[PDB]
């Protein structure tokens, strides 16, 4: 059984790749991503729309209440193992994502060293400049209003009533920014939605940069693959 593995920084179009290979192939893509295991921040954590899914399968290491904490590294890993393991008689899987801690566990761990073949594919952050162009567009998306999906701001809105959420939202990329930036300009999170079109662009531009930095750490902390 084949592990097509795809990883890299935060906006390298990994997902869409996986969706393609998943389409041509009929495989499920497992998501290598702690944060995205919290469907109450679907959008903000970067889960694709169900319509962007193209009828393929995307599998999450688990699914849990923001307030139960972001799934810690180790479990994700044991979880991974299992999700891969009980499918071992299918043809291949895709494994796709950007969790640093998850890939290092892969790298160090004995499970993965045997039993399968690989088709690893690693994307690298290219120029800063063109990353922010991408990131900006991508955030704009997450800010788009829509019948199917809450937006980034709204996930934060709703979720900002329950107080145990707040130190976790402060910890997760994009959200940190959203808070720090309302606390900057003295609005309440609940209001971020109606941020007139001027301050909109900074707040976009801001996240864009928050990601940029992340990208940048993913870069210096990924492992490279055997």
Curated annotation (Swiss-Prot):
Keywords: Crown gall tumor, Cytokinin biosynthesis, Plasmid, Transferase. Its EC number is 2.5.1.27. The keyword Transferase applies. Transmembrane segments: none annotated. GO terms for biological process: cytokinin biosynthetic process. GO terms for molecular function: AMP dimethylallyltransferase activity. It comes from the Bacteria. InterPro entries: P-loop_NTPase, Tzs. Pfam families: IPT (PF01745). It catalyses: dimethylallyl diphosphate + AMP = N(6)-(dimethylallyl)adenosine 5'-phosphate + diphosphate. Transfers dimethylallyl groups to AMP as part of the biosynthesis of cytokinin phytohormones. This is Adenylate dimethylallyltransferase. It comes from Agrobacterium fabrum (strain C58 / ATCC 33970) (Agrobacterium tumefaciens (strain C58)).
């Amino acid at each position: 059984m084949l592990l097509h593995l795809i990883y890299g920084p935060t906006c390298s179009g990994k997902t869409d790749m996986a969706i393609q290979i998943a389409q041509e192939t009929g495989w499920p893509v497992v998501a290598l991503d702690r944060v995205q295991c919290c469907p109450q921040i679907a959008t903000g954590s970067g889960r694709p729309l169900e319509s962007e899914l193209q009828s393929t399968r995307r599998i999450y290491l688990d699914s849990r209440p923001l307030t139960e904490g972001i799934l810690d590294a180790e479990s994700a890993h044991r979880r991974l193992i299992f999700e891969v393991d009980w499918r071992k008689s299918e043809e291949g899987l895709i494994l796709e994502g950007g969790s640093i801690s998850l890939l290092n566990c892969m790298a160090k761990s004995p499970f993965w060293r045997s039993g399968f073949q690989w088709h690893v594919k690693r994307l690298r952050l290219g120029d800063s400049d063109a990353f922010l162009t991408r990131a900006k567009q991508r955030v704009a998306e997450m800010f788009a209003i829509r019948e199917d999906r809450p937006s980034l701001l709204e996930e934060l809105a709703e979720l900002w009533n329950y107080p145990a959420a707040r130190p976790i939202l402060e910890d997760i990329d994009g959200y940190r920014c959203a808070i720090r930036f309302a606390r900057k300009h003295d609005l309440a999170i609940s209001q971020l939605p109606n941020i007139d079109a001027g301050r909109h662009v900074e707040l976009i531009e801001a996240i864009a940069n928050e990601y940029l930095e992340h990208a940048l750490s993913q870069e210096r902390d990924f492992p490279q693959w055997p």
